[PDB]
Design a protein around this nucleic acid. Structure first.
Ligand SMILES: O=c1[nH]cnc2c1ncn2[C@@H]1O[C@H](COP(=O)(O)OP(=O)(O)OP(=O)(O)O)[C@@H](O)[C@H]1O
Ligand SMILES: [Ca+2]
Length: 426
DNA sequence: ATTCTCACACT
DNA sequence: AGTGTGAG
């Protein structure tokens, strides 16, 4: 098994929240700009950055005041706020615009508010038979890069792209409808069409990767951004992985990836090929070890899930520093604000998607604790009523209050979280 | 003191 | 059910 059975793409909207704001406010187009939340603290936290501003060093996680030091002419758009918290509706609605367009071409897996995996295997098979056996012109691939080409015996970027594409298409075996490289190329043709449709019908640009699985497609998508697509063939994997830091591969960006590096004494994905599957299973567990053994050879089997809608709907707010909640009536009021935005989104979900959540997950963070969450408790979600959820959420957390007072909350809360789960068809 | 979602493995 | 990891 060479892991070449499928054609999978990953589409990523370029600096998505910035694009939504630039479409709305033309004064922001083709300018260094960023999208910010919470204007009062250090000018707002940056959550999205246009490519013109990235050339000044502006990134996410930065404070707007700091970003303005790197880029004095940075323009800012601020996220809507509703009931004291950032409100992402505008961006979720734009996300829906794009996913509905993608769904015309293939079945998609929503991966995040601005990326989707695309399973193109069947679409490719139908384009191949409609294609008689005539050649794929480079005109059908006007923004595609072939990873690893050109090679062998031009100083500008578009020149290189074309030379790589010409070498690929020259050597393509169009008479063999079962060559995986041919299937990828047809897949790339379809993704060009899908990206043209997205830009025509929404004004939004995106990048894409086309490969044989989700991990290679995601890696490919990042190789030539913005507004370009990249085909990573099975054959391109040994050279690509030979200098690819382990942490770049999806799921290895964290503690497991650091353990792979430290325990094995390696730096690059390709270096994993020298270990047996049992060796990797002994260090990292049966599942992780088998996964790493196949993945360093370019092979991964995670399916594209036919799922365009999230499985949970959640509402959280952080209260860092001196703003940590300290009174019972503070905690009730913020629980109510979260439960009100949750009710709004749930009722829209019951009208748009014909389902009802049935479990309510309540989570809190305590000043001094270390982790994303300190505690998770659940109860039934029987009615989409903000006052009832918020009452119920308090009920299941009210005993975490270590204070002997009834009107004080010790120790102070640095996060409230409400999440609706366990949907059933309605 | 960036923040906020959402998915899944493990137990 | 509750915790921990990883991602956009
Ligand atoms: O580190 C994060 N903490 C919280 N939330 C994040 C983070 N990272 C990403 N998000 C969310 O996921 C959207 C698009 O995530 P993204 O990585 O695809 O970033 P962009 O499209 O802006 O730029 P690209 O680099 O893709 O061109 C972001 O706006 C935001 O909603
Ligand atoms: Ca993106």
């Amino acid at each position: 098994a060479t892991g070449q059975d499928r054609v999978v793409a990953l589409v990523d909207m370029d600096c998505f929240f910035v694009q939504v704001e630039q479409r709305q406010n033309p004064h922001l187009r083709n300018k260094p700009c960023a999208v910010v939340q919470y204007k009062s603290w250090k000018g707002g936290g940056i959550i999205a950055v246009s490519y013109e501003a990235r050339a000044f060093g502006v990134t996410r996680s930065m404070w707007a005041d700091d970003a303005k030091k790197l880029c004095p002419d940075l323009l800012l758009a601020q996220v809507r706020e509703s009931r004291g918290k950032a409100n992402l509706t505008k961006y979720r609605e734009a996300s829906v615009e794009v996913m509905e367009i993608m769904s015309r071409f293939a079945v998609i897996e929503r991966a995040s508010i601005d990326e989707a995996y695309v399973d193109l295997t069947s679409a490719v098979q139908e384009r191949l038979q409609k294609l008689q056996g005539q050649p794929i012109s480079a005109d059908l691939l006007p923004s595609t890069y072939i990873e690893g080409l050109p090679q062998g015996p031009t100083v500008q970027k578009e020149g290189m792209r074309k030379q790589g594409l010409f070498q690929w298409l020259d050597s393509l075996q169009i008479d063999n409808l079962t060559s995986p490289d041919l299937q990828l190329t047809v897949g790339a043709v379809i993704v060009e069409e899908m990206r043209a449709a997205i830009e025509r019908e929404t004004g939004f640009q995106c990048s894409a990767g086309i490969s044989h699985n989700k991990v290679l497609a995601k890696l490919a998508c990042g190789l030539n951004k913005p507004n370009r697509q990249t085909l990573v063939s099975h054959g391109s994997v040994p050279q690509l992985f030979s200098q690819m830091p382990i942490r770049k591969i999806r799921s290895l960006g964290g503690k497991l990836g650091a353990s792979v590096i430290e325990i094995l004494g390696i730096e690059y994905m390709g270096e994993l090929t020298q270990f047996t599957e049992s060796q990797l299973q002994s260090h990292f567990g049966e599942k992780n070890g088998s996964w790493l053994y196949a993945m360093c050879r370019g092979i991964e089997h995670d399916p594209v899930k036919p799922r365009q809608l999230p499985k949970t709907i959640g509402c959280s707010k952080n209260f860092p520093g001196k703003t940590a909640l300290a009174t019972r009536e503070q905690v009730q009021w913020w629980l109510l604000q979260l439960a009100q935005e949750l009710e709004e989104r749930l009722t829209k979900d019951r009208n748009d998607n014909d389902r009802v959540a049935t479990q309510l997950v309540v989570s809190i963070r305590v000043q001094g604790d270390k982790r994303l969450s300190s505690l998770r408790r659940c109860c039934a979600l029987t009615r989409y009523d903000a006052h009832k959820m918020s009452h119920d959420a308090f009920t299941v957390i009210k005993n975490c209050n270590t204070s002997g007072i009834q009107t004080e909350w010790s120790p102070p809360l640095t996060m409230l979280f409400l999440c609706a789960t366990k949907f059933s068809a309605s």
